[PDB]
Structure formats: structure tokens, C-alpha cells
Amino acid sequence: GAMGQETDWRSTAFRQKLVSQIEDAMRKAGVAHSKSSKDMESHVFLKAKTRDEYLSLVARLIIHFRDIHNKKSQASV
């Protein structure tokens, strides 16, 4: 798989993998404004209080991206 535990979201592998996801969704999402994925993920982390807060804000971000590019929906940035 990838990992067994779940009490170390501060691990490089963790943030790393997540960073790639956000970068992938954005790419296919077709957007441009903020600094960059790396910068976006970094902010979310420092903005989060726990592995949940981050994983939460991250998911919403990725999902919102898929919708914007998905079209035929609301999509409000």
C-alpha cells in the first residue's frame, strides 16, 4: 500500500503525496491565479491544526477544481 499508521501527517511522504494530488487536479482543472500548488498546499498545512483539518481543506479544494472543469454545474471560486 503506502503506510500503516495514521498519526504522522507531518511526514514528508504524507504532504508529498497530497501535494501531487492537488497539483494533478489543478492541472486537469485548467486554472491560473494563485502562486502555485506547492505554495497552495504549504498554506493549507500551516493553516490546518491537525491531519483532519488539512485533509479536509485539501479534499474540498481538489473537488472544487474537478467541478469547475467538469462544467454543467455551479462552481464558485
Swiss-Prot record:
Intracellular or extracellular location(s): Cytoplasm; Nucleus
Origin superkingdom: Eukaryota
Free-text tissue specificity from the UniProt record: Expressed in all tissues examined, including heart, brain, lung, spleen, thymus, pancreas, blood leukocyte and placenta. However, the level of expression varied, with highest expression in the placenta and peripheral blood and lowest in the pancreas and kidney.
Induction profile: By 12-O-tetradecanoylphorbol-13-acetate (TPA).
PTM notes: Ubiquitinated by TRIM11, leading to proteasomal degradation.
Subunit (UniProt): Component of the Mediator complex, which is composed of MED1, MED4, MED6, MED7, MED8, MED9, MED10, MED11, MED12, MED13, MED13L, MED14, MED15, MED16, MED17, MED18, MED19, MED20, MED21, MED22, MED23, MED24, MED25, MED26, MED27, MED29, MED30, MED31, CCNC, CDK8 and CDC2L6/CDK11. The MED12, MED13, CCNC and CDK8 subunits form a distinct module termed the CDK8 module. Mediator containing the CDK8 module is less active than Mediator lacking this module in supporting transcriptional activation.
UniProt-recorded name of the protein: Mediator of RNA polymerase II transcription subunit 15
Organism: Homo sapiens
Residues of the full protein shown: 5 to 78 of 788
